[PDB]
Design a protein around this ligand. Sequence first.
Ligand SMILES: [K+]
Ligand SMILES: [Zn+2]
Ligand SMILES: [Zn+2]
Ligand SMILES: [Zn+2]
Ligand SMILES: [Zn+2]
Ligand SMILES: [Zn+2]
Ligand SMILES: [Zn+2]
Ligand SMILES: [Zn+2]
Ligand SMILES: [Zn+2]
Ligand SMILES: [Zn+2]
Ligand SMILES: [Zn+2]
Ligand SMILES: [Zn+2]
Ligand SMILES: [Zn+2]
Ligand SMILES: [Zn+2]
Ligand SMILES: [Zn+2]
Ligand SMILES: [Zn+2]
Ligand SMILES: [Zn+2]
Ligand SMILES: [Zn+2]
Ligand SMILES: [Zn+2]
Ligand SMILES: [Zn+2]
Lengths: 676, 676, 676
Amino acid sequence: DSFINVINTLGRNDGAKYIGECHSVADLRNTEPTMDGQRIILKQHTAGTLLGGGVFRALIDGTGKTDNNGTVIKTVGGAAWLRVNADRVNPFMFGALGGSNDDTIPVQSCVDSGKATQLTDAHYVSNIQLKYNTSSIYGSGLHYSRLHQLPSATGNCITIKDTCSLIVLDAFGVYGTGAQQGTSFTAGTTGIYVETPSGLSADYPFHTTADPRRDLCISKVHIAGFDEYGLNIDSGNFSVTTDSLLVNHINQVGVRCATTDWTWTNIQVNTCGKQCLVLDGCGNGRIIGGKFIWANWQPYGTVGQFPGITINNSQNMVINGIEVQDCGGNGIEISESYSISMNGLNTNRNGINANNTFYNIVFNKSDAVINGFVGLNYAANSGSGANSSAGNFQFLSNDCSVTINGVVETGYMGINFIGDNNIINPTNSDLSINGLVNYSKTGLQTMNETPTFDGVSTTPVYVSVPSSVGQVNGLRLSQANKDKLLYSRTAGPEGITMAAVIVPTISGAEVFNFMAIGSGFSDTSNSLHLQLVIDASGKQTIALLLGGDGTTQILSGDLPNDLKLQSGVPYHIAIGAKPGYFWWSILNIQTGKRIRRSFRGAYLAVPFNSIFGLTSSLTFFSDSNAGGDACSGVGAKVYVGMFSSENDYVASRYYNLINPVDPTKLISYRILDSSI
Amino acid sequence: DSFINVINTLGRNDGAKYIGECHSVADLRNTEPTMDGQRIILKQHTAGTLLGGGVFRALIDGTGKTDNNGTVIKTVGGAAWLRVNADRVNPFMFGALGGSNDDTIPVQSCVDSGKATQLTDAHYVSNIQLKYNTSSIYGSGLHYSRLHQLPSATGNCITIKDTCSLIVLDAFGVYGTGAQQGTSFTAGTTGIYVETPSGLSADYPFHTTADPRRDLCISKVHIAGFDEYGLNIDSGNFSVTTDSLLVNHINQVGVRCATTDWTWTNIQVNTCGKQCLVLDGCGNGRIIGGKFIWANWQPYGTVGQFPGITINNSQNMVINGIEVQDCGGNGIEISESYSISMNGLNTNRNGINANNTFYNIVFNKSDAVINGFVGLNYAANSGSGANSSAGNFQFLSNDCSVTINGVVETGYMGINFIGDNNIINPTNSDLSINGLVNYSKTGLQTMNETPTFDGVSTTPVYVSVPSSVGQVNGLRLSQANKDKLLYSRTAGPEGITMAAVIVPTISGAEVFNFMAIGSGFSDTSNSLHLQLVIDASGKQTIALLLGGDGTTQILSGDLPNDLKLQSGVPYHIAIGAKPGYFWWSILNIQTGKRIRRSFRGAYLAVPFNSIFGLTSSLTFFSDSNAGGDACSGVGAKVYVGMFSSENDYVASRYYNLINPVDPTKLISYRILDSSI
Amino acid sequence: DSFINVINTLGRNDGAKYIGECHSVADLRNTEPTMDGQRIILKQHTAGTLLGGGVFRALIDGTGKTDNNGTVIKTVGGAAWLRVNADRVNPFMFGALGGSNDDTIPVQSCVDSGKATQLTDAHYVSNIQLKYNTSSIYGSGLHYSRLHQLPSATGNCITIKDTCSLIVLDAFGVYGTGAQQGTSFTAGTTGIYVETPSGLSADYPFHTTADPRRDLCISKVHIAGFDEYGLNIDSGNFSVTTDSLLVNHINQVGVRCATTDWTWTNIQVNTCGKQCLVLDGCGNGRIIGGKFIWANWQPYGTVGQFPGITINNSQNMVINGIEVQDCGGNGIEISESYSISMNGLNTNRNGINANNTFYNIVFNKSDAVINGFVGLNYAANSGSGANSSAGNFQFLSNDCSVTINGVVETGYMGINFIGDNNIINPTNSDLSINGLVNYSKTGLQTMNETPTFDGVSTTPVYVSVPSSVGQVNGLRLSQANKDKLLYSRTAGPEGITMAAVIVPTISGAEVFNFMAIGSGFSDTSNSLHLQLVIDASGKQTIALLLGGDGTTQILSGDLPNDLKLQSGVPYHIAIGAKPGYFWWSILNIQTGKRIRRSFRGAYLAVPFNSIFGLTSSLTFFSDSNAGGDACSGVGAKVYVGMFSSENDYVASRYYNLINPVDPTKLISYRILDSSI
Ligand SMILES: [K+]
Ligand SMILES: [Zn+2]
Ligand SMILES: [Zn+2]
Ligand SMILES: [Zn+2]
Ligand SMILES: [Zn+2]
Ligand SMILES: [Zn+2]
Ligand SMILES: [Zn+2]
Ligand SMILES: [Zn+2]
Ligand SMILES: [Zn+2]
Ligand SMILES: [Zn+2]
Ligand SMILES: [Zn+2]
Ligand SMILES: [Zn+2]
Ligand SMILES: [Zn+2]
Ligand SMILES: [Zn+2]
Ligand SMILES: [Zn+2]
Ligand SMILES: [Zn+2]
Ligand SMILES: [Zn+2]
Ligand SMILES: [Zn+2]
Ligand SMILES: [Zn+2]
Ligand SMILES: [Zn+2]
């Protein structure tokens, strides 16, 4: 009778509704099991949440088990209910609520549970401590599964204690008050802190006491919105690996490391009020793949300059494939550091808080070997006028020992007459750049072809030069006498480099013929002229005139008023010329300020091969013909070499602003101090 | 009593069968809960599959919940059944069937669900879109957990929408029609497409609109079998990280990237009908660890040549530790690109679709700094005769600015008389290789020892040379007069390099003695000879004669007919010789085709130290004794230097085929244009 | 009535206890379902274990299903019970017990199951084989989730079979008998072995037969405590990726690889009885980010020397950003290898089993290009006296072709008079270091300023030198005649390098003035002295005397007895002197043993600019004034050059111990063999 009816009721689709369950862990503690391994259903952890439920099985004898409020629940009678859960725990098992609830204690219980933790959601916490080799954390993304520090909390969102080794932190977020872009911070906060070990263990990897061997992996973790540090690895910790770490929106320092013996791969740090990265006392570590951008972010309101990267008091660092870009101040400051090795390095368009003021790498009492350097300044290339670095390298001391190789000057056209290196400050440090011999340090014997002085009167006249030219007198340049220096050498297909110190006297309308190849200007003149043209109103034009290959082309540009050459000021004026590749540069030797243009590819109507068929001779301060325009002012330190890129020209200027470009290519070098 | 039978019936081992369950989600929609939080068992998602079942709990008030056919199931009365599932969703929860079923909608439901997706199986789909910061996908392997595009589908298997950021794609496969090797493709398909963002958001990382910050990780993903692209990252996307990406069997382009600001580590692309990798307008990115093989794969039937890697219109790239190998055409084509930095670069055995035709790196209007280059051509080393690159480097324009350092010629024996660089095309570009000064660009003063002419008659005779020798006449070489050039210099333990242009007159049987150290040939001769021996049938043998260290050795080889020297053709003939290290090279200066062999280690019976005991003098075109064999033809541009590796010899040939090898090692250089 | 009491009983909180269950998988085989898809609860896998339970669903039609003892259970009647389990399996489902139980068979069942395996715990095993593309393994940490080889087992803990491709091994430990530090091993054990493939399939990636394409990822795996190998990848396997692999405590070789075409990133190997890493016949591979430490670990009792890294019979390797440190013998031995490319390389403080005995890189019949080299020997820098490498580089043959660039000598102070290179053995190999021209190999013409001889008698006297000086006689140095060499050249702000061979006659108390800048010693003397001061007891002090910038400073040190200069022994004595930067070096040219000190930064009271104001001339063997102290012994091979770092000085000594430092900086070089 009732039997058949009971069975049919239980057999309907909703039949599970008739099996009772505990409505809270509090009920579970008041439910005594009557048999071993007894199964019980938990509807939820805390009454009225519908979260944290599951199935439990009983141990009648609970001695040796401890109530942990989520996976081991003990009854008054001493039994233990064990959550059926083979693998990872999650905070809801310990009473987490999600939303805006403070889930600190549930989360702390997970990482203390003896198993890895899965973040399935976002949880607010104040401060969490990772203590054990079981304290791993996994999410399923850099954003939606995350810990989020409460607005009222200070200190470290996560602290990795010195008892915690061999864990994985993978694919979750660690967010602070300022995680969303453009929002404010809570003072005194850090995303992840790895404390300094207080001792050394002898039973690794089974240690339960302090040990310096972190031997742990932070993998695809997103840290965002903290005040003092995103990630801060303190001294004494070994083998903290990071891999695809992403740090965003830090009020101060994105990442600080102060320890040895570690490797990071594919790190990105973006938008910090101070440095993106501080290496302070680091040694014997590796950074492989790095992007450090928008350091010294002005809206975060920090007073003072801070570089994209601080490398201080460090040694034996290999840093490969990193980029430092769009930072508000200097790119990289290397201070009091030994043996910094960098292989593939990109620094461009930093110093964005004040135009033409900061430098991409600043050396101070440091040694470094840097290869594969690049730094196309994309603001200079597009001509947008946005703030960017004054130049690539600055040396604050002369006791550095530094080697730099790469593309020191990129070689785009220069729409705004500027490039990567717009202020060049030479150094007396033990510097080698691009394998170029420093002319001041060589005893190498070279050819030195003698030019012939020409003018209406053929006696050279010498007049005073400013003392920054490093000589007493130079060659008097006048339009009336057509003072010039003629070489019989003709340009060949390998190209030529020509440079000189010129002190222009600038008055009215005038054509300055700084230097030329050949003479004349026509479809068959096979000639080059570098000219400064001044009109009656004082407007200045730098013009490159090319004739040959059956045509002519004028590559000219009007200088803005703030870039004009000034009368009586010494400039180093240089050109590189070869088929299909012409560049010019004008450098104020007193301020280091430079203007430049480079012409390749579509900027040239033709390559102008016929300029270089060994028919057109080289002349300084005019062309080779008696009727050519000349100059007004003084000339000094005339240099003829085989072709140098603008890359190498700029590189050699870090040795000295007016010396020969490349001793191994030097053809002629005439001081012109009362002799020719 | 009926109580006791019910209780006993449920208590049997199979008692669970008496608790009813829903047989489908359709039943679930027709089951109204009678209590809040009611538990219900779902047998399966779709009737008759036994897949996708689980436990659900009821919300009586389901307003604000939407039926999604998997984890939220709505009743007619408005209640909501919520699947008990804390973490990731999988397609079976939404009705996927696996096997040959089109599981597109179940999979799309997963990635739209608000949580990460776990692939537990292979699922056919047509097209999937990833839209949200929750749209992560995880598998458990590169093959068995995968999405598989249906043969009838076209377009992108996966599209990452510009609203989707901060996700992880980890450890699963994305397969197309051609995933299995040797199979055909479906026209118009792409594995993973990252679309161009249409806007910029101001509330990252909480954005719900278009944004360029992908900030996501593709990790241990296997893409195979698509037509147009495996992975295609379009313009405007930042921070798409790839890590251990594997791309296989792509009909056209393995990976295309067209954006800036990203890092990849350990990428492998294998077997593509066109490029393995296209970088098109990329900038400020990093590739760290890369293997690009079997590009331009002939069986995929693409018409035309395509390099392993195209780098076009790109800038500020750091590409470290990559290899390009076994590709059908050129290795890497760099076009219209600035500041490409490469540190540790391996290109070998490309050009496999046509022997001796393609080059490992092709530069066209580009600048690059390349360090740590290697390229052991394993086909040349094994003597297999398989198609391989003509040589390492080719310059399509002379406006490139390029530095290359490394092992340009590997230095294995040369069983088939070839090596890495078998056709050398010199360039007038702004090129620097291995830090070698280009002789045509230097004004450096060196020693230039004067040899003495010897012959039966001691008056030199001069005859014309082909115009490719770059002079009017050379030294007449005859066996009758035994014309030779004697140096008093003896070879020392650092070794020696000797080279000359020789225009051989080849007629009958004859011994040409190109150059020698010392004289005689015996156990105590302390001598070296490089000879071409021609027998009565016209067969040519290149013989290296070594005498000293108590023995003699002849290292000879018969030249195949297609490699024989031709009468009246100018060849640059060079040797480097030192204890334990001898190499020779013969270079056709009109075609650039080269033959060579190198001897170190086990190939030498002894080091032949005593050749270098400062006792044996250097001679060109004979040995030092009056009875020595001589030459027939004309000699020119005799070069003596200190020891250069074949690496540096070959590197210097890219400057010019006949000029001195190393200006810093130059001891003598005599043109022989009607003077000695 | 009774119906409501049944309902009330089933409805109590513990009501779940009334639904029966199978107490073991054996019972499940004896429980016949009476309905298709029937649900059953399994209490546990094995009776009395409380492990491996779950829910199963029945298929009455069991054809096509095979009993696997964990997830498919067959009844006597032919039904099949299928474990409800969408994703990964774990060993407890197959009867694992954990703890001290041998769980080999349960773990083997997992990896053969057709799905990936999750390790939730530590499991003892003997030997496991990975056979299928489903045989992935995931844990949740490098320690607590792991396989542990039983002490009684030998051989390979894990073998990856050549049928197994495209799997992931992620975040678990593989432990052997010696996993805990300081414990003993089981002979003949290996952690992970990748066997040599026996064939090639044509249906990759769907192959079920032998194939060389492993195409798999070992990620965050921790291998520890095995005898012969931690990880051993045998020949013929392609694309075994490792990423964040950690190997600890290996009795013999940490990692062996013997195959081609692979990439590793961020590998760490620590504490091995023999090598940390053996590359045996490897080619066309990449290692990017590596740490290899404590190789040849003395307590593991291996007899004989073994390097940190063995590279033998290998080719086309790109190895970037690795470090080898604290190894017992040599750092890296490169043998019989072509084209080894290394970019960013740190080797320091190896050879710790015997002080001053081993070298950081040992080359034997190999070619290599090494850039970004660093190696700050932290033991020499701290003055701890701990055993460390004799020096950076050693060449076992003269047929190597090697380029090295970086920080060859770091330039720290030298508290104990030593540095990175304390024994220098020059080589006749084809070697280039730091781009320095080898003086023995150059024909470059340089300046060679002639000094003037001074003495009480102005006729120089010549006496014999030891034959190791490479000349018959040198300049007789005496205190009575004050024999000296004066240069009129004055030191400038760029600095100066001075060096000479001095054969000191050491007797009583005496002041040797090896070389000087200027004369006198006072606040305005603007002078430098390098002195050896000997007192009446025989104590030797090396003193650098600096006067200028308004002050004086004496930088002196007492030599320990074992570092004293010996009478009649030739020493190469060198200084680099520049503002803020002074170093000196004393090199025994017969043993190669060197002592040295360097002064920068805080070690200097002032930069001493006024020494370099072009007022103080250079003198050898005394100062410029008639009253200066002189020397006792013989002088030879006097060298003046522009400033060289100690880095370049040391680098050039690998060419030859007594030759000029830098041909491009050479100002004077006087042999002094019976002439001035
Ligand atoms: K690298
Ligand atoms: Zn939430
Ligand atoms: Zn504070
Ligand atoms: Zn502590
Ligand atoms: Zn005139
Ligand atoms: Zn025209
Ligand atoms: Zn003109
Ligand atoms: Zn139904
Ligand atoms: Zn399937
Ligand atoms: Zn859009
Ligand atoms: Zn990685
Ligand atoms: Zn004769
Ligand atoms: Zn002979
Ligand atoms: Zn003879
Ligand atoms: Zn039983
Ligand atoms: Zn356990
Ligand atoms: Zn096999
Ligand atoms: Zn003195
Ligand atoms: Zn004083
Ligand atoms: Zn140098």
